[PDB]
Amino acid sequence: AYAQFFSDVREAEGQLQKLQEALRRKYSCDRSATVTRLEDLLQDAQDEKEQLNEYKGHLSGLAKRAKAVSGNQEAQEAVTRLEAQHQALVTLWHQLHVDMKSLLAWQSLRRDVQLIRSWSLATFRTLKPEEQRQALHSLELHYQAFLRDSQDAGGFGPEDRLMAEREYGSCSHHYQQLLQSLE
């Protein structure tokens, strides 16, 4: 009778391990990942996220069966060992998730900073005010997102927020300088 149970335990033990390797393989991104790809992977991650939630009822089901089995302590110590293993995945999923968001914000903020800093007075004049203001809308959107999502991100730190502010203000300054020439 313990066989049918411990077989299910070993089966459940394998799926979580398989799920761990799936997370690492799919969502370990670096600073060479494009914006479009990061966005795609971020919504893909939700599918893995939903499996983890549905696995709670699977673990609880084994927790019950574990109780209704001498060496019952071992049967319960095994399920407990799985719940610890499962929480690690949720913790891992969130870490990978918040890492991808930080990269996404960062990659976007780079596109904006480059764009705005590429402006010269001759290029600026050919632009409509709606187009000028738009580039600064996109700048603050991705700047403020970066300060927010880089916090729990392991790939970025306070020095990267320090620089971001500098790169951001850099463009605000350039913008303010370009406007002061047209008036």
From Swiss-Prot:
<protein>
    <recommendedName>
        <fullName>Plectin</fullName>
    </recommendedName>
</protein>
<feature type="modified residue" description="Phosphoserine">
    <location>
        <position position="120"/>
    </location>
</feature>
<comment type="similarity">
    <text>Belongs to the plakin or cytolinker family.</text>
</comment>
<comment type="subunit">
    <text>Homodimer or homotetramer. Interacts (via actin-binding domain) with SYNE3. Interacts (via calponin-homology (CH) 1 domain) with VIM (via rod region). Interacts (via N-terminus) with DST isoform 2 (via N-terminus). Interacts with FER. Interacts with TOR1A. Interacts with ANK3. Identified in complexes that contain VIM, EZR, AHNAK, BFSP1, BFSP2, ANK2, PLEC, PRX and spectrin. Interacts with COL17A1.</text>
</comment>
<feature type="repeat" description="Spectrin 3">
    <location>
        <begin position="1"/>
        <end position="69"/>
    </location>
</feature>
<comment type="function">
    <text>Interlinks intermediate filaments with microtubules and microfilaments and anchors intermediate filaments to desmosomes or hemidesmosomes. Could also bind muscle proteins such as actin to membrane complexes in muscle. May be involved not only in the filaments network, but also in the regulation of their dynamics. Structural component of muscle. Isoform 9 plays a major role in the maintenance of myofiber integrity.</text>
</comment>
